[PDB]
Amino acid sequence: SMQEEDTFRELRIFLRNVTHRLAIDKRFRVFTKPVDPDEVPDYRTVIKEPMDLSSVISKIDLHKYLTVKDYLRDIDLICSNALEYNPDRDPGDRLIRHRACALRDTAYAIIKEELDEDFEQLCEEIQESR
Ligand SMILES: O=S(=O)(N1C[C@@H]2C[C@H]3CCNC[C@]2(C1)O3)C(F)(F)F
Ligand SMILES: O=S(=O)(N1C[C@@H]2C[C@H]3CCNC[C@]2(C1)O3)C(F)(F)F
Ligand SMILES: O=S(=O)(N1C[C@@H]2C[C@H]3CCNC[C@]2(C1)O3)C(F)(F)F
C-alpha cells in the first residue's frame, strides 16, 4: 500500500540521520570509507565481508534495509571486522578496538532514545508479509 511505502520512506530518513551523526564524529573517521586495497592488500584476505559507513548510506538509498534490526546487523559487522583485523595488545590495535566498541554502543544508544518500539514492530510486520 501507499501507507506501507510511506512507512519505509520514514525508516530511510531516520537511518540516514543516525548514520550522518556517526560519520561526522572524529573518533569514527577510520570507519567512514572502505579500506584502500593499495595501502592494505592483506585486508580482503582476512575480512570476508567488509563494511563501512559510506557503504551503509549507499545501502539505505538502494532500499536494502526494511527494519532497524537489519541496519544494526551492518553496524555490528563494522565493529566485529575491526575486532578481528586488529586483535593484538599494542596501542594501535587497542585504540581501534575501543573506537569500534564506541561506534556500536553510540548507534544502539541513539536508537534506544529516538526509535519508537511500535514503529520498528510495524516495519517487521510489513517485511514478514512480503
Ligand atoms: O563528510 S565526511 O567527509 N565523510 C565521507 C563519507 C561519505 C559520506 C557518506 C557516509 N559515510 C561517511 C561519510 C563521512 O559521509 C566527514 F566529515 F569526514 F564525516
Ligand atoms: O538491543 S535491543 O535488544 N535491539 C533489538 C530491537 C529489535 C530490533 C529493531 C530495531 N531497533 C531495536 C532493536 C535493538 O533491534 C534494544 F535494546 F531493545 F533496543
Ligand atoms: O594477523 S592479522 O593478519 N593482522 C592484521 C594487522 C596487520 C598488522 C598491523 C596492525 N595490527 C594488527 C594486524 C593483525 O597486524 C589478523 F588476522 F588480521 F589479525
Curated annotation (Swiss-Prot):
Tissue expression from the record:
Highly expressed in estrogen receptor positive breast tumors and in osteosarcoma tumors.
Q: Hey, which family's this protein in? A: Belongs to the AAA ATPase family.
Instruction: Kindly list the places in or outside the cell where this protein is found, as annotated in its UniProt entry.
Output: Nucleus
Under what conditions is it induced? Answer: Up-regulated in breast, uterus, colon, ovary, and stomach tumors. Induced in breast cancer cells overexpressing NCOA3 or treated with estrogen. Down-regulated in 5-fluorouracil-resistant derivatives of the colon cancer cell line HCT 116.
UniProt function note: May be a transcriptional coactivator of the nuclear receptor ESR1 required to induce the expression of a subset of estradiol target genes, such as CCND1, MYC and E2F1. May play a role in the recruitment or occupancy of CREBBP at some ESR1 target gene promoters. May be required for histone hyperacetylation. Involved in the estrogen-induced cell proliferation and cell cycle progression of breast cancer cells.
Q: Which intervals hold domain Bromo?
A: 3-114
Domain of life, source organism: Eukaryota
Subunit field text: Interacts with ESR1 and NCOA3 and these interactions are enhanced by estradiol. Interacts with acetylated lysine residues on histone H1.4, H2A, H2B and H3 (in vitro).
Name-wise, this protein is ATPase family AAA domain-containing protein 2
Per the database entry, which stretches of residues form a coiled coil? Answer: 108-130
Q: Which residues of the full protein are shown?
A: 981 to 1108 of 1390
